[PDB]
């Protein structure tokens, strides 16, 4: 059984900067099992304070083993995937486990308007999850 | 503020449990709020096939929620804690809510008398609960 699904997360007014190092924003829950995304706009910790950290969390309790490959990307103004980062294998998700990237994208890259990744100051993240069971 | 308490549960004739996957045994209730333990001798589900699953259940609560950390261990023949598993952080309990570990210990480990954890065919579990 293969189940692939996605979620698009729009974070408005991203430049507002009301989340300090270690602080988190969580997305609404989604499914194809319930999942959510968690982002640290100023990094998970001191070694990552210069990056957005981004994680996929399994919220619900599965009945059988869940392994998932995941890919996170940023959508530009044309809706195209850019700066994608993909898990190098399927990871085991149990209830309450997250997996992701502590250094998903540089804050100083994302925040510079010229790179075009915050159109109307909106950060749009796209998460694709391929579940095998 | 912390309120920490414990319960010891001895299950006799453990090797004779007829519970199939998904079936459950619950303990008597205890308190320092009423709680009990629940075990699935043959696992909760497919993910936990061939494990004993172990849970803390909040049976009765006068308010909406309780936050608690918990630790389960198996007491060996000397009464010592072994094969412990702990929540690490506090979990949110409401009346009727359980939290625990579906893969608490392999059934085939527990059931082999040679590991010494079923003296006289008795399983002794020890739960420590910290309401924080």
């Amino acid at each position: 059984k293969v189940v692939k699904f996605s979620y698009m997360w729009t974070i408005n007014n991203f430049s507002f900067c009301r989340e300090e190092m270690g602080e988190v924003i969580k997305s609404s829950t989604f499914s194809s099992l319930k999942w959510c995304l968690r982002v640290n706009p100023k990094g998970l910790d001191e070694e990552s304070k210069d990056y957005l950290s981004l994680y996929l969390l399994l919220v619900s309790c599965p009945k059988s083993e869940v392994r998932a490959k995941f890919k996170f990307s940023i959508l530009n103004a044309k809706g195209e995937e850019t700066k994608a980062m993909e898990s190098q294998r399927a990871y085991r998700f149990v209830q309450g486990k997250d997996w992701g990237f502590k250094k998903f994208i540089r804050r100083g890259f994302l925040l510079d308007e010229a790179n075009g990744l915050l159109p109307d100051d909106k950060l749009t993240l796209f998460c694709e999850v391929s579940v095998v069971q | 503020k912390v309120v920490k308490f414990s319960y010891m549960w001895t299950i006799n004739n453990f090797s004779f449990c007829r519970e199939e996957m998904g079936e459950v045994i619950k303990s008597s209730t205890f308190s320092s709020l009423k709680w009990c333990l629940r075990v699935n001798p043959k696992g909760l589900d497919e993910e936990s096939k061939d494990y004993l699953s172990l849970y803390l259940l909040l049976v009765s609560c006068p308010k909406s929620e309780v936050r608690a950390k918990f630790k389960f261990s198996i007491l060996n023949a000397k009464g010592e804690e072994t094969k412990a598993m702990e929540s690490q952080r506090a979990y949110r309990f409401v009346q009727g809510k359980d939290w625990g570990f579906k893969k608490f210990i392999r059934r085939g480990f527990l059931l082999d008398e040679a590991n010494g954890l079923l003296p006289d065919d008795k399983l002794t579990l020890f739960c420590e609960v910290s309401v924080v």
Partner: peptide, 11 residues
Amino acid sequence: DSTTEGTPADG
């Protein structure tokens, strides 16, 4: 990367 270690509980 994961933000947790140890044993997440289920329920």
